[PDB]
Design a protein around this ligand. Sequence first.
Ligand SMILES: [Cl-]
Ligand SMILES: [Cl-]
Ligand SMILES: [Cl-]
Ligand SMILES: [Cl-]
Ligand SMILES: [K+]
Ligand SMILES: [Mg+2]
Ligand SMILES: [Mg+2]
Ligand SMILES: [Mg+2]
Ligand SMILES: [Mg+2]
Ligand SMILES: [Mg+2]
Ligand SMILES: [Mg+2]
Ligand SMILES: [Mg+2]
Ligand SMILES: [Mg+2]
Ligand SMILES: [Mg+2]
Ligand SMILES: [Mg+2]
Ligand SMILES: [Mg+2]
Ligand SMILES: [Mg+2]
Ligand SMILES: [Mg+2]
Ligand SMILES: [Mg+2]
Ligand SMILES: [Mg+2]
Ligand SMILES: [Mg+2]
Ligand SMILES: [Mg+2]
Ligand SMILES: [Mg+2]
Ligand SMILES: [Mg+2]
Ligand SMILES: [Mg+2]
Ligand SMILES: [Mg+2]
Ligand SMILES: [Mg+2]
Ligand SMILES: [Mg+2]
Ligand SMILES: [Mg+2]
Ligand SMILES: [Mg+2]
Ligand SMILES: [Mg+2]
Ligand SMILES: [Mg+2]
Ligand SMILES: [Mg+2]
Ligand SMILES: [Mg+2]
Ligand SMILES: [Mg+2]
Ligand SMILES: [Mg+2]
Ligand SMILES: [Mg+2]
Ligand SMILES: [Mg+2]
Ligand SMILES: [Mg+2]
Ligand SMILES: [Mg+2]
Ligand SMILES: [Mg+2]
Ligand SMILES: [Mg+2]
Ligand SMILES: [Mg+2]
Ligand SMILES: [Mg+2]
Ligand SMILES: [Mg+2]
Ligand SMILES: [Mg+2]
Ligand SMILES: [Mg+2]
Ligand SMILES: [Mg+2]
Ligand SMILES: [Mg+2]
Ligand SMILES: [Mg+2]
Ligand SMILES: [Mg+2]
Ligand SMILES: [Mg+2]
Ligand code: NA
Ligand code: NA
Ligand code: NA
Ligand code: NA
Ligand code: NA
Ligand code: NA
Ligand code: NA
Ligand code: NA
Ligand code: NA
Ligand code: NA
Ligand code: NA
Ligand code: NA
Ligand code: NA
Ligand code: NA
Ligand code: NA
Ligand code: NA
Ligand code: NA
Ligand code: NA
Ligand code: NA
Ligand code: NA
Ligand code: NA
Ligand code: NA
Lengths: 73, 56, 237, 7
Amino acid sequence: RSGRFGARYGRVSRRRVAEIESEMNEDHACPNCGEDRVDRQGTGIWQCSYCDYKFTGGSYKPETPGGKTVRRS
Amino acid sequence: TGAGTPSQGKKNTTTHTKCRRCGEKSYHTKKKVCSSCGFGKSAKRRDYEWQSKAGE
Amino acid sequence: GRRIQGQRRGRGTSTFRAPSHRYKADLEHRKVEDGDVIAGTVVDIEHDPARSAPVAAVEFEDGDRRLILAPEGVGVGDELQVGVSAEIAPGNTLPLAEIPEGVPVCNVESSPGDGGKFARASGVNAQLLTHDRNVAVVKLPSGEMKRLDPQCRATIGVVAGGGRTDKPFVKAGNKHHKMKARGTKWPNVRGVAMNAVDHPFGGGGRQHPGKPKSISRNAPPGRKVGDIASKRTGRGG
Amino acid sequence: XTXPFXX
RNA sequence: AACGACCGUAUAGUACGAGAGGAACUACGGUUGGUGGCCACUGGUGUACCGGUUGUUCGAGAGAGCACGUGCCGGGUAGCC
RNA sequence: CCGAGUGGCUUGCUACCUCGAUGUCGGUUCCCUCCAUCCUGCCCGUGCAGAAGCGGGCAAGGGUGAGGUUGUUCGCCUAUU
RNA sequence: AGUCGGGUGAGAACCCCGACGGCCUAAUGGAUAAGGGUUCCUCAGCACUGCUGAUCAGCUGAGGGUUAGCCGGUCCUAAGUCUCACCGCAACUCGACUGAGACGAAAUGGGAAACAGGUUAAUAUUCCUGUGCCAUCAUGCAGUGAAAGUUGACGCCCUGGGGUCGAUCACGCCGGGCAUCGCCCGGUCGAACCGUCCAACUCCGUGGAAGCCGUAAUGGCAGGAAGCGGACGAACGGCGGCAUAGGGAAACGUGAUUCAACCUGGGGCCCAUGAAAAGACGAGCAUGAUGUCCGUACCGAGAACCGACACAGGUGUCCAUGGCGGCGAAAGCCAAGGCCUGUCGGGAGCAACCAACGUUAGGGAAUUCGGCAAGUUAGUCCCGUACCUUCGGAAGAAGGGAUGCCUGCUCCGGAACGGAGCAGGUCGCAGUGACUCGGAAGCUCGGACUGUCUAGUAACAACAUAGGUGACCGCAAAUCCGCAAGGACUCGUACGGUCACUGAAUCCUGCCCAGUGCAGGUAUCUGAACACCUCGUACAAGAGGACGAAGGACCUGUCAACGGCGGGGGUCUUAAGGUAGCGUAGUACCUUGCCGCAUCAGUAGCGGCUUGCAUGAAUGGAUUAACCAGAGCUUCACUGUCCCAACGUUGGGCCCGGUGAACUGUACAUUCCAGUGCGGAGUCUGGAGACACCCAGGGGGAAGCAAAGACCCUAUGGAGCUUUACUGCAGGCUGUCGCUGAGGACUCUCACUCCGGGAGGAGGACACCGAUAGCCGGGC
RNA sequence: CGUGGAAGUCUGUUAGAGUUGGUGUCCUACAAUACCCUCUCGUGAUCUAUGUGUAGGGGUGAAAGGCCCAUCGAGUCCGGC
Ligand SMILES: [Cl-]
Ligand SMILES: [Cl-]
Ligand SMILES: [Cl-]
Ligand SMILES: [Cl-]
Ligand SMILES: [K+]
Ligand SMILES: [Mg+2]
Ligand SMILES: [Mg+2]
Ligand SMILES: [Mg+2]
Ligand SMILES: [Mg+2]
Ligand SMILES: [Mg+2]
Ligand SMILES: [Mg+2]
Ligand SMILES: [Mg+2]
Ligand SMILES: [Mg+2]
Ligand SMILES: [Mg+2]
Ligand SMILES: [Mg+2]
Ligand SMILES: [Mg+2]
Ligand SMILES: [Mg+2]
Ligand SMILES: [Mg+2]
Ligand SMILES: [Mg+2]
Ligand SMILES: [Mg+2]
Ligand SMILES: [Mg+2]
Ligand SMILES: [Mg+2]
Ligand SMILES: [Mg+2]
Ligand SMILES: [Mg+2]
Ligand SMILES: [Mg+2]
Ligand SMILES: [Mg+2]
Ligand SMILES: [Mg+2]
Ligand SMILES: [Mg+2]
Ligand SMILES: [Mg+2]
Ligand SMILES: [Mg+2]
Ligand SMILES: [Mg+2]
Ligand SMILES: [Mg+2]
Ligand SMILES: [Mg+2]
Ligand SMILES: [Mg+2]
Ligand SMILES: [Mg+2]
Ligand SMILES: [Mg+2]
Ligand SMILES: [Mg+2]
Ligand SMILES: [Mg+2]
Ligand SMILES: [Mg+2]
Ligand SMILES: [Mg+2]
Ligand SMILES: [Mg+2]
Ligand SMILES: [Mg+2]
Ligand SMILES: [Mg+2]
Ligand SMILES: [Mg+2]
Ligand SMILES: [Mg+2]
Ligand SMILES: [Mg+2]
Ligand SMILES: [Mg+2]
Ligand SMILES: [Mg+2]
Ligand SMILES: [Mg+2]
Ligand SMILES: [Mg+2]
Ligand SMILES: [Mg+2]
Ligand SMILES: [Mg+2]
Ligand code: NA
Ligand code: NA
Ligand code: NA
Ligand code: NA
Ligand code: NA
Ligand code: NA
Ligand code: NA
Ligand code: NA
Ligand code: NA
Ligand code: NA
Ligand code: NA
Ligand code: NA
Ligand code: NA
Ligand code: NA
Ligand code: NA
Ligand code: NA
Ligand code: NA
Ligand code: NA
Ligand code: NA
Ligand code: NA
Ligand code: NA
Ligand code: NA
């Protein structure tokens, strides 16, 4: 995680990098199929290593609280 | 690094060259303008009154 | 003295310009004589250097290939539509008039046809509230209520890449790299750390501003620094 | 011009 | 300045003094600082020399070169100190 | 207390000398000197029994060392003398 | 870094041959870019140049020398540049935009095509021999396909597979070397091109896995896994030809390991997204013709470049795979190749003195501002490891042990000429035996960290940083550039970017709006010009009035805005009256404060107290792990820093041949002690001393040489900087006039503006622009 | 336990970059900023070649009034003179 930062940058900074990156690296349910196979391709880009679906999503998450709102209305 | 002798070593760039119009080695081959006659900038010849004493 | 930094800026030299020659596409809404019959298929999802956010490549029915300000959830294969009759789903672009109230919108036009102006940064989004035969009330991401022509076209959904600001840069090196893709001089030296000659706050035996930081709006460039026309300062009260 | 001659 | 000064012993547990305590002349031994000289002795050096030994090169052996002006290690004559 | 002086280390005063520059403080090294003498020699007095001192006289031959804090000079401190 | 012979010559230490001895190993070798410009080769020379000499030469003189369809240029496009047009400007050789065109890459971007040998004093993928290839066109045959697509064409980190050269190992052959042995060295060749082979990736069929397949790793699958079959498909690689070509005195090998080049995959990262165009492919074959123009010598550096020099400086790319060594592109040593030109020599055991340096007994920082300088430690393995800590770190903490050779072996692996161990034997004072190679520990201060800086006395605590906070702005924006035409931000849009402050984390950040600043409001007061009203004037100047914009008065908001946080008494100034903390501070005058630690002794250091001359909260306060060529202090270790100096080594120094400057010089000058003098005299005065000349020395004096004193003052000197100094100038805000139109509030559309491809939409007599007026106005 | 191989990460005269001490050598120098040893960085806010842009009250500046051809609190040249 933030282990790469050695004893630098102080708590908050690395604590947050670890968290964000932890969630970022989790198994994400593909919007197309349902397989937990979505991975970040870059800043805001995600893709299903299964069906290859490539889509826009959060910057560090594939789904942002804001996005989930659109759906509704 | 001294600005003196040691900084003289890198000076191997060619700029001012024999000018096609006036024959002076003042043609800046990177600027394509002659510092002497003005070839490349002015159709007229580069000339200023300050190149001599006011009353002359 | 010497022109302060803000003055060197205006001159538009290299140091201060954006590496435009490295930018992908001036994201702007398409044009349609009318009808709305226009629609294309998402072909790819790229990284937009100018906005540190993803953008989508699209091929339209009339074989037109262009990059588009991508909302969230737009994936390859998806079919977007741009027109008065365009469906009411995320990704589609249509005049506010046709958009139902309460729907999150992004890349809104100021004047109809300008191709989008408001809400285009990572994860932001406007908010359509009021309909009228005359005015469409949009609540911009800054929280301001903007009165717009119901003919101004806008895209449904929120901009992609949201939450980008949540992770700290942590190290100068990370700013460096990002900064290098914008029209900005970085790093930043505080006036107070400069010589009197270089900035109104320069000089002294110790570091401190030589006057109150709040400057008048009517101040001339070269002297307008610090807190510009501040209605107030601090966090208290 | 800098204290001792000529530092 | 070619010499300056100090400690110790005998004098004497004496003169003196209630006691406590406690000298001197003189003769001795030594120390310190300074001075001039010298090298038997001790010590240093001693890239004179002899030996051990690592790397490498001359095929091995033998015998050598280089490793900063001896590769390092051990011993060390004269002389100089 | 008051009064009379010598010195030219301190400080102050003056503005004579140098502003076409006479290189700073402290330290260091190396040489000569002064006496208003700390020790050493020879002496006087003693509130000088002795021992240890206290004060003074002649006297500049020799000596007057090592360290802890401090850039310090100065000074404070330690153990030797 | 030379030495002995010898050569040439009028002349030889340094020109040439040989031998012996050395030096250079990412360079002192090889190929080159820029730059130089004939320095290249040859012959003849020595007046010049060469740190001495010269027969030599980058010198002088005269000749000669650079050969390309397939190496570069040329072509393409990059940041960006110019030209024309348009517009601006008093104007231009000026100026931003827009449109069109052109320019912009010689090592090192993209790119049609060449290899091998031979040759000259000097060129060489250029000439010659052999062989091959590309393009265009022409003719003939085929073909009617033909433009969609592919390619050119791409970041960073890790990694697998294919694989050549090289290197090494085994054995054979050819040639050499060595001489107790049987070893050691070199060689054992052979291209472009043509043909052919194909692993990886992708896909297809078959198959039918419900747990298997697979990797260095990740991974894969009923949406179809393994296996089998197949389509597509790689090398500068293999294989065949090329080649009874070439090359070699000869032999003119075969296998293997590790494998640069080259080929092809997999994984990971981005608040960073990693060129473009020409061109190629797509799209056959034969024969013939054509392929012009420019560069090509040489140097590429301790003598051919820049630095005034044959300058110890500076100056890009490729050779990173030669051997031993070892982790290594490290040291040390040695090839290939280069060199003895980092170009003056000869002589003295060669003194003093100086530069680099070795070794010094006993002591061991006593030296000193300070351990400055030097020294100690050191490689690898095993054991073991404190406080503190942000849990990462601290940490190689510290500390202890081991370490060679020789004999025979074991384990890992396909194997290495890879690695890890075992038993026995054995030498030395010493086994990382040289070389390579940390001294260690603690306390306090500062800045969080990596990073930045005064090119040439400052590397630091200064700057930056992430992080924290405040301010401005909805884009026809805020901010900024331009005289204008116009422009940066901006292919951007509040998760933005402008303007500032603070400066990681951690616990926190009190009180004050009185002054100043900024901003909002405002009955009333003050507030310019035009128009308007009165007076005045046959008109006019002019005087007064009415209305009143911004602004000010006044009011309010605001301190993570400038800044403030006391005296007195049991409020006063001027708003408040110092909260948490910290405290004799890098802030404390008094001061070496007092007490304690530590030492024989401690203006130091650390801790406590602390009334703080004159601490204190984003002018950030406290505190803090890690980090540091940062400041202070303590300990162990170590030592010529010191007691106290000695001896030694090399280069000078000294003598000799040759070369050969400069600084400085009013004159006189063998001085010394005193005195005098504008008070700091070799020269005046009095005495003393004093025969001349020369060598070496360390520098006492010549207020030594070098610099018209920086300090200080003065001059109605200069400049940079500041401000509520004087005066002005931009700029911003605001009223008014013009553009400007119809019906103190209001409608419209037609100028004008803006959005829109257009149709048309928004806006609209405003805004913009021109003119003027008031206010703000160190931005200048 | 292994695999993996992150990092403005560590050691490092790899290349390359930098410039702390010696206040050494030099100081009519080899040199108008050099030499030697010592020292810092060395996968990144890295170093570097070439091409290109910014011009003088203007640039450029992680800010030292640093730099803009040995020239900088306002470059250089000529002119005003
Ligand atoms: Cl940013
Ligand atoms: Cl003592
Ligand atoms: Cl070429
Ligand atoms: Cl793989
Ligand atoms: K003076
Ligand atoms: Mg300069
Ligand atoms: Mg755009
Ligand atoms: Mg932020
Ligand atoms: Mg930039
Ligand atoms: Mg800053
Ligand atoms: Mg400053
Ligand atoms: Mg100013
Ligand atoms: Mg500050
Ligand atoms: Mg000065
Ligand atoms: Mg030797
Ligand atoms: Mg050793
Ligand atoms: Mg003098
Ligand atoms: Mg007397
Ligand atoms: Mg005497
Ligand atoms: Mg000749
Ligand atoms: Mg020649
Ligand atoms: Mg071109
Ligand atoms: Mg090329
Ligand atoms: Mg040649
Ligand atoms: Mg050639
Ligand atoms: Mg030379
Ligand atoms: Mg000793
Ligand atoms: Mg001491
Ligand atoms: Mg002492
Ligand atoms: Mg040292
Ligand atoms: Mg095995
Ligand atoms: Mg202190
Ligand atoms: Mg720091
Ligand atoms: Mg400096
Ligand atoms: Mg430093
Ligand atoms: Mg320095
Ligand atoms: Mg900040
Ligand atoms: Mg900030
Ligand atoms: Mg700071
Ligand atoms: Mg204290
Ligand atoms: Mg506060
Ligand atoms: Mg401050
Ligand atoms: Mg006389
Ligand atoms: Mg003067
Ligand atoms: Mg002054
Ligand atoms: Mg002035
Ligand atoms: Mg427009
Ligand atoms: Mg001024
Ligand atoms: Mg690092
Ligand atoms: Mg390093
Ligand atoms: Mg450049
Ligand atoms: Mg300053
Ligand atoms: Na200031
Ligand atoms: Na007197
Ligand atoms: Na006096
Ligand atoms: Na004088
Ligand atoms: Na002195
Ligand atoms: Na005496
Ligand atoms: Na003392
Ligand atoms: Na082949
Ligand atoms: Na090797
Ligand atoms: Na010579
Ligand atoms: Na670093
Ligand atoms: Na106030
Ligand atoms: Na106020
Ligand atoms: Na304060
Ligand atoms: Na650092
Ligand atoms: Na020594
Ligand atoms: Na002298
Ligand atoms: Na000035
Ligand atoms: Na693991
Ligand atoms: Na240095
Ligand atoms: Na100027
Ligand atoms: Na003049």
